[PDB]
């Protein structure tokens, strides 16, 4: 869940302005252009902040996006609407720079998406712009810039 469902017990202190963006609720990218192509797809599971792949059913229902990677990588999920079950996808043709889930890494390392849509060190897909940031016991994020697929 992008937004922590459990309510907080205390009001936050809005005095500092540093290191206030390394959160899982942060949706989108650090740098966003007005000419970016954005699509919306039915969500299979929770692909938020993970690479997505197109999955076709038996034909009765339309195609959807599921967390994955490898040669089946189609795009990167940057946002999700839970009420409508909709996943926001930036196509792999379009380049993306933002915080993505990392497999539980130093700047300059070449990262590729695994079968679960998690970035892992090495075809390369992105370059790590920072180090792993731990949000939960198994949840790690990393700032990466995706520039398509190149061997």
């Amino acid at each position: 869940m992008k937004n922590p469902q459990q309510d907080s017990g205390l009001l936050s202190n809005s005095i500092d302005f540093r290191d206030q963006n390394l959160i899982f609720s942060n949706s989108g990218g650090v740098c966003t252009s007005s000419k970016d192509k954005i699509e919306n797809y039915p969500a299979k599971g929770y692909p938020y902040k993970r690479g997505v792949k197109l999955s076709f059913g038996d034909g009765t229902t339309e195609l959807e996006v599921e967390a994955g990677g490898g040669d089946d990588l189609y795009g990167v999920c940057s946002d999700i609407d839970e009420f409508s079950g909709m996943a926001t996808v930036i196509p792999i043709t379009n380049n993306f720079t933002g915080y993505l889930t990392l497999k539980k890494v130093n700047p300059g390392d070449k990262l590729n998406f695994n079968q679960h849509g998690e970035l892992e060190k090495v075809s390369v897909n992105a370059i790590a712009l920072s180090k792993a940031h731990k949000l939960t016991e198994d949840l790690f994020i990393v700032l990466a810039s995706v520039f398509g697929n190149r061997a």
């Binding site: 907080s8 009001l11 809005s14 206030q20 990218g29």
Partner: protein, 313 residues
């Protein structure tokens, strides 16, 4: 109602003899707001903004600009309802127990309804004050066998995400070490733009006795209390620094501002003891009555409370 229910009239005639809670001294008049709820929760929403990356330089042609993110937080306050039962004497049976000096039965410890309700209400108010101060509900002096309360029900002492300092066991008698810990906590305190506000400190009698010692060979001009007051005045923009002593606390110091914007107590309008309409009546002279009271409702901002515990091991 007063011509039919004797107990209601007795409560009306005895309610004015119950002492006011001592917790009022720990808050400003504008820091307390009554709410209309017995059991349940109340939710508040706060919005915040953060910077995602470094600023983008506007030179020549560029369409990729750094972004600013927004985040919402929901804070929930829980209100719980609790009840006590106490035994007293039936109204019609009082004449058979009236004596020259007192009304009641010393041998069996039976009291008139008015006196029993007054004593029970006093005890309940003591418990409520203890809950508001410490954040726990218990009857043992040790503090174990606590009542398992609901989440988002906290007091000043046990409030999370606040500045906490621990004076070591070997330095329990060293006021210099204690005041060093207080200095560290005060430095880590974050008042923000609400710094110009009065401060409140709550200490135990042993801590007060150590404070009134001369400042330290040893200066005979000012005391540790004066040094602490000046230190707190350095951070509250030279505002009033009220100091109080509470027997409930044991080797613990509490420091917090008296500003509604940072800390607010929103208790239920039925928090204080209230008699119930259910009275158990039998063929004997002993009857039972019930008292209700509501707990919960303390809201605080993060990193605005200093809690110093002097380990006595």
């Amino acid at each position: 109602l007063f011509d039919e229910n004797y107990y209601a009239k007795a409560v009306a005639n005895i309610i004015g003899e119950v002492k006011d809670p001592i917790m009022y001294k720990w808050f400003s008049p504008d820091q307390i707001e009554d709410v209309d709820l017995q059991m349940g929760y109340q939710k508040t929403v706060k919005w915040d903004a953060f910077l995602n990356a470094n600023p983008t330089t506007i030179a020549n042609e560029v369409n990729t600009i750094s972004t600013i993110g927004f985040s919402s937080e929901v804070v929930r306050l829980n209100y719980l309802k609790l009840q006590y039962k106490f035994r007293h004497l039936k109204q019609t049976s009082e004449k058979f127990y009236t004596s020259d000096s007192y009304i009641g039965d010393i041998n069996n410890n039976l009291l008139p309804f008015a006196q029993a309700y007054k004593l029970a209400s006093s005890e309940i108010i003591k418990l409520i004050n203890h809950f508001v101060l410490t954040g726990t509900v218990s009857i043992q002096k040790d503090g174990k066998n606590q009542k398992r309360l609901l989440p988002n029900m906290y007091g000043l002492l046990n409030m999370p995400e606040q500045i906490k300092e621990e004076v070591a066991s070997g330095d329990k008698d060293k006021m210099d070490k204690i005041f060093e810990k207080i200095e560290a906590g005060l430095s880590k305190l974050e008042l923000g733009d609400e710094f110009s506000t009065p401060m409140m400190v709550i200490v135990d009698p042993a801590t007060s006795l150590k404070l009134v010692k001369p400042y330290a060979a040893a200066s005979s001009c000012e005391k540790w209390e004066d040094v602490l007051i000046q230190t707190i005045k350095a951070i509250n923009n030279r505002e009033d620094v009220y100091i109080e002593t509470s027997n409930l606390l044991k080797h613990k110091i509490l420091i917090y501002p008296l500003n509604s914007e940072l800390i607010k107590f929103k208790p239920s309008k039925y928090m204080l003891p209230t008699p119930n309409e259910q009275v158990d009546k039998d063929s004997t002279d002993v009857a039972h009555s019930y008292i209700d009271f509501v707990l919960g409702g303390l809201l605080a901002t993060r990193k605005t409370i200093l809690q110093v515990n002097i380990k006595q091991s």
